[PDB]
């Protein structure tokens, strides 16, 4: 019949118990620190970390010198150091278990533009990304959750068409200019 795909998965897992003061406060601290929209962002990054830890645990229980352990562990370690959450020197499967959620959250584009200094606050960074002002390499990205890589860290900049790189000021600027010039002939 149809040539559809219907292959999909949930990117987050809800907590087992709701209404714990400790968990609620900790997640709210993460949300406030990284300008997250709701608890689903922190839950999805928590779920990504949990999946990574699960794969690492499977490889750890797997015997050392096993070809599968070597291949998959090296692949996982190099992708972690590629996104920059793991240091270049700490390329061991044991240190994967030592990772937390904060170092994942600090690789998002929203936090990266604020840290690089293109934005005044984390929420200003999120809105600035969402209004298509920031480009990475040649491609303009409007997804705040864009996990940046180490090689792409340096190339974060403003988009050319934005009223922060090249010209063409915004509609409110142009309207104010034309109103000011129409007030004096």
């Amino acid at each position: 019949p149809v040539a559809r795909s219907w292959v999909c998965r949930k990117t987050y897992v809800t907590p087992r118990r709701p209404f714990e003061k400790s968990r609620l406060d900790q997640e709210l601290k993460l949300i406030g620190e990284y300008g997250l929209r709701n608890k689903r962002e922190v839950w999805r990054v928590k779920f990504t970390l949990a999946k990574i830890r699960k794969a690492a645990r499977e490889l750890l229980t797997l015997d050392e010198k096993d070809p599968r352990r070597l291949f998959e562990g090296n692949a996982l370690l190099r992708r972690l150091v590629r996104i920059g959450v793991l240091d270049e020197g700490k390329m061991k499967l044991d240190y994967i278990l030592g990772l937390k959620i904060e170092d994942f959250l600090e690789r998002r584009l929203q936090t990266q533009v604020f840290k690089l200094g293109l934005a005044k606050s984390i929420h200003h960074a999120r809105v600035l990304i969402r209004q298509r002002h920031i480009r990475v390499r040649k491609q303009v990205v409007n997804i705040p959750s864009f996990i940046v890589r180490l090689d792409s860290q340096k190339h974060i900049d403003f988009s050319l068409r934005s009223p922060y790189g090249g010209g063409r000021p915004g509609r409110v600027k142009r309207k104010n200019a034309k109103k000011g010039q129409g007030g004096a002939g």
């Binding site: 019949p1 149809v2 040539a3 795909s5 070809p67 070597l70 291949f71």
Partner: protein, 262 residues
């Protein structure tokens, strides 16, 4: 069903065709021919997906109907002709020739060959018998049967078909120390030298084959296609020389290639 099937599903097609899921519901169900459909490569996907000459089935139909493809030296206008193992696809308008051979990862590779090598084709005999008037008949892995062969040729040996005549030029006996190739299973596409053949009467015999790296792998007898005498193949081998590399070595080979190019 009340009769033979004439449709093939895209997801039910053989994996080595590299047919993706999204483009179509169906697959080009190969027409009946010399080779089985599970181990044949239809001309449509050969010219559309492997060489990227055509964009769709209509374009590849136009190429076929303008009579440029000579499979086994014969012009074949069938869009779903089963090419199969060790067949010559000659496009003389471009002056290019292809020997259909499995690569390392057990799937047919685009293998360009010279015109002076494209005029002969090795074949594995399948059954030998004697027809009417005491005439020795010999069938091959294709649907190709020949008469009056050399009595020295026994079953699962190799012969050299000379094209445009359908005759024998030379032959290879199947025995220990002869370079061969696996044509099915997990070891499909691997080049090695026969080292042992153990016999199980009433069952499939199993051969042990060692490649150039010394790696020993076993397979069934029916999956063995001898393609050379000793350690020298009778045809030009594909890239990689039929040497199976595990995931680590191809990973670091990719890394070395990218590092040299960058």
């Amino acid at each position: 069903a009340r009769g033979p099937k004439k449709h093939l599903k895209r997801v039910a097609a053989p994996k080595h065709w590299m047919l993706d899921k999204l483009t179509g519901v169906f697959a080009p169900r190969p027409s009946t021919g010399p080779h089985k459909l599970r181990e044949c490569l239809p001309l449509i996907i050969f010219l559309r997906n492997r060489l990227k000459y055509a964009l769709t089935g209509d374009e590849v139909k136009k190429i076929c109907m303008q009579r440029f493809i000579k499979i086994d030296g014969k012009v074949r206008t069938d869009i779903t002709y089963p090419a199969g193992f060790m067949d010559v696809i000659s496009i003389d308008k471009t002056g290019e020739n292809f020997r259909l051979i499995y690569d390392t990862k057990g799937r047919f590779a685009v293998h360009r060959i010279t015109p002076e090598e494209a005029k002969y084709k090795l074949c594995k005999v399948r059954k030998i018998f004697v027809g009417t008037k005491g005439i020795p008949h010999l069938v091959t892995h294709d649907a190709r049967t020949i008469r009056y062969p050399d009595p020295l040729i026994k079953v699962n040996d190799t012969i050299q078909i000379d094209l445009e005549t359908g005759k024998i030029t030379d032959f290879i006996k199947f025995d220990t120390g002869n370079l061969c190739m696996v044509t099915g299973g997990a070891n499909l596409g691997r080049i090695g030298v026969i080292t042992n053949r153990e016999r199980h009467p009433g069952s499939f015999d199993v051969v042990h084959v060692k490649d150039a790296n010394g790696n020993s792998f076993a397979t069934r007898l029916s999956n063995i296609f001898v393609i050379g005498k000793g350690n020298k193949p009778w045809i030009s081998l594909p890239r990689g020389k039929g040497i199976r590399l595990t995931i680590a070595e191809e990973r670091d080979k990719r890394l070395a290639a990218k590092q040299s190019s960058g």
